[PDB]
Symmetry: C3
Subunit: 150 residues, 3 copies
């Protein structure tokens, strides 16, 4: 099975930046409703999608209590619980993060380590790459992810 | 086999909106010479791509009378005919629709039912997720799609 | 295994345009430090991604004299070497190129032939499709690619 997901958020000065589950030192952070972790959101949608289960807007509306104030690993692990209950064995996640600042290169090890631990995948099965928008989208973070299961 | 397809269209106020084969009540709709159904176009290109057959610009140009003015479902069924004749067995389609309005949430069932009916896939093999652009692309509808076959 | 990658470049008047390893006659070309071949970059990142090896920013930085000034095909071939050494057999590449000008249609055969030769894949396993941005991004070339291996 395959799943594909995307996420993006406005970034603003003096807000915390969360990506791949981690708080990243940055001059900008998401202007969100959530922690705005675009990588987790894209991955979560990709997982749900692989089983036709909907998306984070359907399954995690803030109006449900359990989701209000929650960090995005809660959404990811619930999607993992849902596909696992349907017999899924996650094999791989490959995703691209796009943002002009800050540079994610120095945080490569930490970001992969976190995704590896969250999705319970070996490091060679976490394919994370970083891009800038080349001035296409200087005020957003963007994420696009593909997952592979069984 | 895997295929990847994308489409985007300018949205204009007061034009009809077509997605996944359906008319969706909306304040905005594609400005296009086609019906502008980004979902159909992205899926069609992904199917073509999975066999290297080209893209919808090549196979369904507005110059070709058989295709001019037709709804986009006609091009998807033709792409399905072409890949089926080359032995394809479509397994899964996962795609993301991005647009700032209207909300697609209320239409989720009919949209997924449509894709399942047109592509002849069970609903758990239709992975449809909805996003807004968070202000990055407030005047366009975008779709990106992955298909898996065989 | 699966890998996903993306690339974009600002386009500027009177610069040469390189795509899929070829010179493409054009009024606009990438402004950059590389040849700005978005197809090559996105394919290379997708390959690297399929094995968790990093991305082109990590492995091919212009601080490294081995890589500065090299054509992007040299990067793609090195990524091929690295995954092949880890047992991979590339099976398929499917990608989308997005740009408002020049038209890529007239170059389809040459572009696909180049990808086929470079990646040593049969033509039906090269899924290249072309799009314009519909004015979303009229001054960039964008590429997004999925690769499948084994
Ligand atoms: Mg989000
Ligand atoms: Mg279209
Ligand atoms: Mg590049």
């Amino acid at each position: 099975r395959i799943g594909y997901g995307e996420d993006s958020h406005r970034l603003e000065e003096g807000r915390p930046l969360y990506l791949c589950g981690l708080l990243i030192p940055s001059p900008v952070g998401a202007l969100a409703h959530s922690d705005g972790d675009a990588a987790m959101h894209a991955l979560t949608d990709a997982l749900l999608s692989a089983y036709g289960l909907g998306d984070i807007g359907l399954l995690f509306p803030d109006t449900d209590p359990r989701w209000r104030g929650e960090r995005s690993e809660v959404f990811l692990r619930e999607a993992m619980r849902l596909v696992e209950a349907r017999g899924a064995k996650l094999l791989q996640a490959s995703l691209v993060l796009t943002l002009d600042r800050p540079k994610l290169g120095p945080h490569r090890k930490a970001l992969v380590d976190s995704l590896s631990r969250l999705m319970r995948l070996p490091q060679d099965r976490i394919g994370l790459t970083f891009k800038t928008s080349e001035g296409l989208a200087p005020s957003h973070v963007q994420a696009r992810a593909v997952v592979l299961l069984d």
